[PDB]
Design an enzyme around this catalytic site. Structure first.
Site, PDB file in Angstrom:
ATOM      1  N   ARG A  16       0.983  -1.095   0.024  1.00 17.99           N
ATOM      2  CA  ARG A  16      -0.052   0.033  -0.021  1.00 17.99           C
ATOM      3  C   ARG A  16       0.808   1.429  -0.027  1.00 17.99           C
ATOM      4  O   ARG A  16       0.714   2.256  -0.685  1.00 17.99           O
ATOM      5  CB  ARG A  16      -0.789   0.003   1.119  1.00 17.99           C
ATOM      6  CG  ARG A  16      -1.865  -1.112   1.286  1.00 17.99           C
ATOM      7  CD  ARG A  16      -2.880  -0.682   2.583  1.00 17.99           C
ATOM      8  NE  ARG A  16      -3.482  -2.215   2.816  1.00 17.99           N
ATOM      9  CZ  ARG A  16      -3.556  -2.564   4.023  1.00 17.99           C
ATOM     10  NH1 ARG A  16      -2.937  -1.956   5.093  1.00 17.99           N
ATOM     11  NH2 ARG A  16      -3.956  -3.811   4.424  1.00 17.99           N
ATOM     12  N   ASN A  64     -13.421  24.089  -0.817  1.00 18.61           N
ATOM     13  CA  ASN A  64     -12.112  24.812  -0.496  1.00 18.61           C
ATOM     14  C   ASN A  64     -10.553  24.126  -0.537  1.00 18.61           C
ATOM     15  O   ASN A  64      -9.659  24.714  -0.690  1.00 18.61           O
ATOM     16  CB  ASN A  64     -12.167  25.681   0.558  1.00 18.61           C
ATOM     17  CG  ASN A  64     -12.377  24.938   1.871  1.00 18.61           C
ATOM     18  OD1 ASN A  64     -12.916  23.865   2.034  1.00 18.61           O
ATOM     19  ND2 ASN A  64     -11.535  25.408   2.854  1.00 18.61           N
ATOM     20  N   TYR A  88      -4.798   1.979   6.360  1.00 16.14           N
ATOM     21  CA  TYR A  88      -5.528   1.046   7.445  1.00 16.14           C
ATOM     22  C   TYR A  88      -6.058  -0.359   6.742  1.00 16.14           C
ATOM     23  O   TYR A  88      -6.638  -1.127   7.660  1.00 16.14           O
ATOM     24  CB  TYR A  88      -6.175   1.772   8.537  1.00 16.14           C
ATOM     25  CG  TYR A  88      -5.245   2.727   9.146  1.00 16.14           C
ATOM     26  CD1 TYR A  88      -4.024   2.203  10.040  1.00 16.14           C
ATOM     27  CD2 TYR A  88      -5.432   4.070   9.255  1.00 16.14           C
ATOM     28  CE1 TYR A  88      -3.165   3.073  10.560  1.00 16.14           C
ATOM     29  CE2 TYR A  88      -4.566   4.873   9.820  1.00 16.14           C
ATOM     30  CZ  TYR A  88      -3.559   4.440  10.479  1.00 16.14           C
ATOM     31  OH  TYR A  88      -2.598   5.559  11.033  1.00 16.14           O
ATOM     32  N   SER A 143     -17.102  18.047  -3.804  1.00 21.28           N
ATOM     33  CA  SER A 143     -18.169  19.056  -4.007  1.00 21.28           C
ATOM     34  C   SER A 143     -18.254  19.009  -5.340  1.00 21.28           C
ATOM     35  O   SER A 143     -17.222  19.040  -6.457  1.00 21.28           O
ATOM     36  CB  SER A 143     -17.510  20.620  -3.571  1.00 21.28           C
ATOM     37  OG  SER A 143     -18.508  21.295  -3.821  1.00 21.28           O
ATOM     38  N   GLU A 157     -15.498  17.278  10.441  1.00 20.63           N
ATOM     39  CA  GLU A 157     -14.546  18.490  10.718  1.00 20.63           C
ATOM     40  C   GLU A 157     -15.745  19.676   9.943  1.00 20.63           C
ATOM     41  O   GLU A 157     -15.869  19.521   8.640  1.00 20.63           O
ATOM     42  CB  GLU A 157     -13.387  18.416   9.690  1.00 20.63           C
ATOM     43  CG  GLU A 157     -12.347  17.225  10.013  1.00 20.63           C
ATOM     44  CD  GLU A 157     -11.432  17.627  11.028  1.00 20.63           C
ATOM     45  OE1 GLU A 157     -11.230  18.888  11.324  1.00 20.63           O
ATOM     46  OE2 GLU A 157     -10.747  16.841  11.973  1.00 20.63           O
ATOM     47  N   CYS A 214     -11.359  26.968   6.726  1.00 18.63           N
ATOM     48  CA  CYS A 214     -11.938  26.578   7.891  1.00 18.63           C
ATOM     49  C   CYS A 214     -11.141  27.280   9.128  1.00 18.63           C
ATOM     50  O   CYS A 214     -11.726  27.642   9.985  1.00 18.63           O
ATOM     51  CB  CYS A 214     -12.136  25.091   7.904  1.00 18.63           C
ATOM     52  SG  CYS A 214     -10.418  24.306   8.205  1.00 18.63           S
TER      53      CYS A 214
END
Ligand SMILES: NC(=O)c1ccc[n+]([C@@H]2O[C@H](COP(=O)([O-])OP(=O)(O)OC[C@H]3O[C@@H](n4cnc5c(N)ncnc54)[C@H](O)[C@@H]3O)[C@@H](O)[C@H]2O)c1
Ligand code: NA
Ligand code: NA
Ligand code: NA
Ligand code: NA
Lengths: 499, 499, 499, 499
Positions: free
Chosen positions: D77, D166, D182, D191, D261, D295
């Site tokens: 990975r 953003n 993981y 978006s 978030e 943010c």
């Protein structure tokens, strides 16, 4: 008294304390007198074990004690420690009186130490924060694919705990606690100077249920202890004491796991933005507590130009306004030093500083063979480095005061001593503090407080001549435990499908 | 060649390799001949540094290297290591040829070691799993209320890496990697027997950008290295080698941080439910790989009554069907032992076992001053404990086979040797395995595979005579780093409101 | 009695228990009758709070309780919990009697739960193994050079603990303990079915010193509790109950921190090499304990061909030789189910299995509105998946037995249910066990024992329909704590010199 | 171009980007126009998948992708991620141009984001610092004696990553990275405003070897994505966006593992001892970077009386001396806002502040449908709390300046907003800083720097309305992994002897 009822042999007017030989109290080696620094009088005697008794004790510890400690589950070890705490606590006054008498410790200090010992025992469960092991997945490398490992801690076996004279009770309880909690048997070897408190602590642990064959208390003078350190049945040595002896211990022990807390003094730095009232108070205290017989005692004060005057003035007032005398008076602030020899050295060192341009700002007067006034000697930066008070640890209540241009010079002078145990920094600017934190070469730094190891809630230990490794709740696990790795191989067994 | 172009001094027919003195390759001490075990011929010479050059090098490492290593941010140290990996990798054949020639390592083994060295360097970022520090809240004790601590790791300074002859390239790269990654300067001291690979690795690191004054490579014979170990500027000693030298090192070094990987052999246990094909294959391999010159080589095989016959039969077939000769042939399985002396000892040991009731099941024939056949000696449980092959580590391809009644007897015999590095267990029952895991006194246990430390993806190290502490990705941080505690005091400052 | 002396309102023949409104016991909403499953009789009433009292309580918890809990240092919180443990312990018989009466719990089970509650409270200090924060050095990335961060845990604020009927005492004490220990205020909402034990536990905590305005106990029926879950002052919801309600809770709560223990049953797998005596005993127990009203009760038994016969035979004997009746008899093994409705469902489910090819091997007889015999229904693998007993959790003492060809089929059938709480595996082969460990999709796997969450010494929780997140000593910290990161910037400030 | 060569359908003059359906690029749902905020022109179209394609994709992700991701060992990975980093890096200019065009991001900002994305991918190995599991000994409780547990992390399965407009490239790469590392399969839903960068990143990952059936990129408008969140095959939802949508997501998803978030703005506090040059610079930047569409943008500046004047003066000068225009000019400082609607809101909000006693100190002028000047509005403490600019997050380059009496008032005003993402504090006094650290209710605090999440080297996330849980290298493991506990029972099996 109560605790050591059938143990102490009342013979020839002075109580005779035997050694504990991993099963029974006894001893048949030379008897040794124990004196009080308060009056140089003999207050008891301790029986050292003979060569055969040392050998037999190690054999019991190795063959039986390792398993008695390890085979007592942790849930029970904890009960043993909580019960020993209860016993010490209800015998508080008795424990304290012996500390005052045998060590010359002021009453409040003796009481504090007993209480630290009780708390240490009761918080043994916090030591488990570092007892869990690791589970390592194997697919992060091609060679370890379809493999995995478990890493867990295991007791080393028999730990030899060698303790210094200045924390005769706490150091012994601390070492016994972190050694036992992880499943080890323990051999305690206290300073032959004040071995009474340890004898009492060991008795309380035995009464509390501590596996009888997993502990030993050998009242042996310094070099006779070498026999224990050098033995292959001793897998670890937790030593707290001076640098020179620490060196001897490792050279005699050879390959083994060690924790060496070798003290030395501590420098204190006062930045220009420091609360001078807080600093003056904390620094005075760091200088005189237990007559400076603390590994973390302040031995050098560095203060930036603008606060130096006030700071050194306030610390001087605080130091000379102290009361010296017999430690029994709850009024006395400073008791005696452990031996007349220790006072001789402090005086010789103060003279050396004066001859080299230093000026006494407080104290300086010897008051008897074991009594002295806590002294504060001012010294110019350009000559301080050659002074005995700077180059060495004078285990007494004496410190140097040096004015410095800035933080860089303070850091440089603090780092110029051969030790690196702790350092204290008073100030408020986050940048200056962060810089000092990075550049001071010591095991611990105390911001806006005097250095105080307490019960090791925060790990502590030395850098440079101050030793190696740490003690502390949790962190001590690295010193008396060994890792055991178990690697499982499932290559081609169909657990994973190429992963 | 390419790498050591302007370094190697071609003088008097044999290439002369200088020492690296933390700035420049050089040396003005005695020159020492390096031989190949393949033909006992001189293949190069190395220049040892004089006493003044050792002293000057330590001074550079201490005064400058500590800071060059530490002041190179980790992001850059990682780049240095990844680039050194690239350089070694593209010079793979050259690195391998030297291993084959200087160490007598079979081609496939030499290639494996170079690759392990490359992987170790490239996975330096996995070492960061144990680099973060701790944030300790202070409200869990009344004495620490309104206080708090930060515990972070700090490089110790100068680490002396002393390496053995059998992993001349990997051991040096491993120690340099975990020492440098945490911010330390390093002094490398390879076996004077085969120091060429280390010289090449150090050159690749220097070409990759390793701070020039933060590393040194001193070609010094054993006892001349003592000078380095005993120096106060060396804060840590990472030693991989024999028990006896390890002991000398600590006694000379005194108080310091140590990692001691002292080898010894490893026992293998085969339970009645074990896959005998897997076991026979893995055990044969553990016995002969690199002619048994592996700290983790299998030296004792314990097998339960019902599988003993088959198991020992299959392992014997596998061992005698091996080809011994010059390690260059990609066909050869076993090359020479490092010195005729090593073979002498293996023969004397095999005789000792025979005289004591042992019977050779495979091999036993010496084929030349440095060549021998991998031997498998059967021995009755009742006499094995007195055999030199059991009581000592005979660093050669030779192991004992002992039939046992059950797991308890297997565990007891495995634990009877003075070493405790690793152990292997083949079987499938979770209970028997768990019991063996608990009771085998070794640093690591390999379930259903031969012991193989690899690049330390899983930590490894010894118990008993096999040393102290561990090496491994991440875990090595404890050996070359010291904790620094910072305690902040906000008592009465209004941060907390009684909490 | 003693504990709830001035709290319980003895009115109209039945004791009336008020709600605790973060300051005072009271309530002015509808009164609700509490019945015993032993005789369907009313044994008490609880006063639910009105809408205004719920609103006022949340306001007190948010504005005052958050700070009372947080501003009580941990050292004191621990004292509060240790004292509450002492109080519960000395009122053991009283706590147990209420469990027997209010929950229909057999005497030994009621006593076990009280004791688990006491131990949980006393081991609150072990929860600190996961309370420390992290110190992250910034030099491992170029963008973070000369920067560094501290990551520490902080209480979220007000935690709403919603508990199920089957562990009315322990679940409430567990949630209160891990929530309070980290500094949170707590709102407890017990099953309105058996809220008496929680009322008693909360009173003991208040007597022990638990900050009066930091806890609330609201006796509200299911859907009236939604008001609390949906409130912005509730920062976390620890919910233990059924899947369907758990879903409603999250959809009503919206963004919040959640721990959802949603049960379902557990499958047990018996490998051919399993100790059938151990397995038969553990499995019978897992099936009938507390009349199967345990989230971790065994609902499906999968056994490989060769042991299936014996295994199912022994489990059947063990189950039918059980005594059902009033839980007061220390002789009774199984008491009643919580409601006649629950028994109706078990019977309907057993019929469904029979109609689909299943055969009853033990039990099957209803003995009254709330009493039934623990049933063991055999079923062919080819038809079991469509049975209500497989597809759903029938909260009663009933399990299916299915013979399987091998481990792969066992794993597949175990994973076919929609739940994934725990699974049990009996056998000894390390490879088969490792495979099952990897492939069983559940929060926890018990090797050679029946699933038992105990006090959460080992973390537990679900996968799939069984929920999200874990509870357990230490691990519960993730559910009621939020991280706070503090990044310090020293760029160009001279702390580091490019590093 | 190069990367999306055979993927992009050049039809009808504008490039048409298809969705990636876990195997093949395609889509047969409505086509949607993508516009540039630079000129409101259509620059491409994206094909959304139909209901059947969403259903089929989820089915592939669940049935095959979970296993392809999980069954690809971590070592591979990592290789996939390092290769994807190389591809993005060599296509840097192309990635940047799309960011500038599709998001209106200034050139330097677009380049920074691409580079953050590359670094994030290359540092995937640092995420392993939190991947190891725990080994819990069982002898610390009587009930767990002769028992022990292993706790390890396991991928949850399919993670739905929902990203905001953003950070169209970085957010998608970050979520994909921590989810994949993981062992999870991932569904990306960007978006619909600027989905081009994500399409490009996903293509680079696929070219790098990312398991083809373990990833999906669905260009679906907001509410059509609900279908994915609500599906039982999606075990986790990593959502970065606004508070209101975050709430909808959880209410639709029900029980699942979430990371939310939810942004909001950030307050900055300037203490009287702060370096005003550093502060003014950092604060101006925090206010205008990417036209305040961050943010972590500074929306409120609180400054103590004595520095307020200077501070606000310098920040005003810095803000008005900024150049607004087309983001292509490497000279421009501020580009357009994402939509004319966003500018409308900023203007309405500035008016609201003026009507309520506020005064514009810099900017205030709209320059076109999507262009505006970064504005700094001064406001009296007594009226600021009712202003839209305080009570809400106005996603534009606009902040309030408020003079405060002291730290207590600053902290109170900072905490008065409904958000709690980050906060910034400029000053030097360790006590004031420590107080602010404790009392500011936010996920992260930046001392002497503007808030900047970067690549999550330090974990970040919200408190209050700003969400729950954290993202960050290592810490993100808690959001896309579930613990699995394995408890082994050796009671009476002779492993331990009562311990
Ligand atoms: N907390 C953080 O770390 C962080 C970081 C970046 C941006 N943000 C916040 O995100 C916002 C800016 O992004 P935005 O304007 O695109 O916000 P947003 O909330 O509109 O973005 C929502 C994302 O969710 C999708 N979505 C919308 N409705 C949905 C629904 N009903 N169901 C499922 N998915 C839906 C959208 O298409 C988009 O991909 C700001 O408030 C900003 O502060 C927060
Ligand atoms: Na020795
Ligand atoms: Na030394
Ligand atoms: Na909500
Ligand atoms: Na759902």
């Amino acid at each position: 008294a109560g605790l050591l009822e059938g143990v102490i042999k009342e013979k020839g007017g002075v109580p005779v304390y035997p050694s504990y030989l991993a099963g029974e109290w006894g001893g048949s080696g030379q008897e040794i007198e124990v004196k009080s620094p308060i009056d140089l009088a003999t207050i008891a005697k301790v029986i050292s074990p003979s060569r055969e008794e040392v050998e037999r004790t190690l054999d019991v510890l190795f063959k039986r004690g390792r398993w008695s400690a390890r085979d007592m589950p942790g849930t029970e070890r904890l009960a043993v420690l909580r019960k020993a705490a209860d016993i010490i606590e209800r015998n508080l006054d008795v424990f304290a009186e012996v500390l005052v008498m045998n060590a010359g410790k002021p009453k409040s200090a003796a009481v504090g130490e007993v209480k630290a010992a009780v708390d240490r025992l009761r918080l043994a469960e916090l030591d488990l924060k570092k007892i869990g092991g690791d589970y390592i997945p194997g697919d992060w490398t091609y060679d370890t694919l379809e493999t995995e490992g478990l890493v867990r801690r295991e007791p080393l076996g028999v730990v030899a705990a060698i303790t210094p004279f200045n924390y005769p009770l706490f150091d012994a309880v601390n070492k016994i606690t972190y050694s036992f909690i992880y499943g080890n048997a323990v051999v305690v070897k206290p300073s032959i100077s004040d071995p009474l408190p340890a004898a009492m602590a060991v008795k309380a642990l035995l009464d509390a249920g501590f596996p009888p064959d997993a502990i030993a208390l050998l009242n042996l003078p310094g070099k006779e202890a070498e026999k224990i350190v050098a033995d292959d049945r001793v897998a670890a040595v937790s030593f707290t004491g001076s640098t020179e002896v620490g060196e001897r211990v490792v050279k005699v022990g050879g390959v083994k796991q060690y924790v060496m807390e070798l003290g030395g003094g501590d420098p204190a730095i006062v930045l220009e933005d420091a609360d001078l009232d807080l600093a003056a108070d904390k620094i005075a205290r760091g200088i005189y507590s237990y007559a400076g017989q603390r590994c973390d005692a302040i031995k050098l004060v560095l203060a930036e130009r603008p606060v130096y005057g006030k700071l050194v003035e306030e610390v001087a007032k605080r130091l000379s306004s102290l009361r010296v005398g017999d430690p029994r008076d709850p009024t006395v602030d400073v008791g005696p030093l452990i031996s007349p020899s220790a006072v001789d050295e402090m005086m010789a060192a103060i003279e050396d500083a004066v001859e080299k341009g230093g000026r006494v700002l407080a104290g300086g007067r010897r008051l008897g063979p074991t009594y002295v006034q806590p002294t504060f000697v001012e010294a110019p930066a350009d000559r301080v480095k050659d002074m005995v008070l700077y180059k060495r640890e004078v285990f007494a209540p004496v410190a140097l005061a040096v004015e410095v241009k800035d933080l860089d010079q303070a850091i440089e002078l603090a780092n110029g001593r051969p030790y690196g145990l702790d350092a204290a920094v008073f100030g408020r600017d986050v940048v200056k503090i962060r810089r000092a934190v990075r550049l001071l070469e010591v095991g611990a730094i105390y911001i806006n407080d005097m250095p105080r190891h307490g019960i090791g809630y925060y790990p502590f230990g030395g850098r440079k001549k101050s030793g190696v490794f740490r003690e502390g709740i949790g962190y001590a696990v690295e010193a008396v435990t060994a890792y055991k790795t178990i690697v499982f191989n499932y290559k081609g067994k169909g657990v994973w499908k190429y992963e």
